[PDB]
Design a protein that fits this description.
monomer; 19% strand; alpha/beta; four-stranded mixed sheet; globular; binds 5-phenylpyridine-3-carboxylic acid; Papain-like protease nsp3; 6 helices; 167 residues; 7 strands
């Protein structure tokens, strides 16, 4: 049994809710919240900007030190950093950004990072300002992630379309 409330069950392991991921993280304090990260961990917009704002920029400060030591992530890669006031840990995952011309096949690689964590609160990778089709992102999620994932979708309209169209 876990804390997550109000989710629709899509599969054995994937759940979905119309929710503001910062507000959900603040309520649940999950072990892992996933950030929609980029290679230089610059949390300025989309999910990264909202999560970082909710940490009063502490996520960005920590991330800048991580990059100064380790260099950029790979597209499709991830790192584990603090969850600050939102979660125990933040899994920063880099989905491909279609608005930069990145290969959408890297979306499956991105989702594979979730399998290293038994339970996660996450957004749909590569959705929003990353430019991918969220319907496609949900399909890759269901077909790739085997651990228990609780998806928060910001737009009510999009949430209803994702559920109605789910095979
Ligand atoms: O649900 C998403 O895929 C999503 C994409 N871009 C931004 C957001 C967002 C926007 C404001 C607050 C918290 C999350 C969610």
């Amino acid at each position: 049994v876990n804390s997550f409330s109000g989710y629709l069950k899509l599969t054995d392991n994937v759940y979905i809710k119309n929710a503001d991921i910062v507000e959900e993280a603040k309520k649940v304090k999950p072990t892992v919240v996933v950030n929609a990260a980029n290679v230089y961990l610059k949390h300025g917009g989309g999910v990264a900007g909202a999560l970082n704002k909710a940490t009063n920029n502490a996520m960005q400060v920590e991330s800048d030190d991580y990059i100064a030591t380790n260099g950029p992530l790979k597209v499709g890669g991830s790192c584990v950093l603090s969850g600050h006031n939102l979660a125990k840990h933040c899994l920063h995952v880099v989905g491909p950004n279609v608005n930069k011309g990145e290969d959408i096949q890297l979306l499956k690689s991105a989702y594979e990072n979730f399998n290293q964590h038994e339970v996660l609160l996450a957004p749909l990778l590569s959705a929003g300002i990353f430019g991918a089709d969220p319907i496609h992102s949900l399909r890759v999620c269901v077909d790739t992630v085997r651990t228990n994932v609780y998806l928060a979708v910001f737009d009510k309209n999009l949430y209803d379309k994702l559920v109605s169209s789910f095979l």
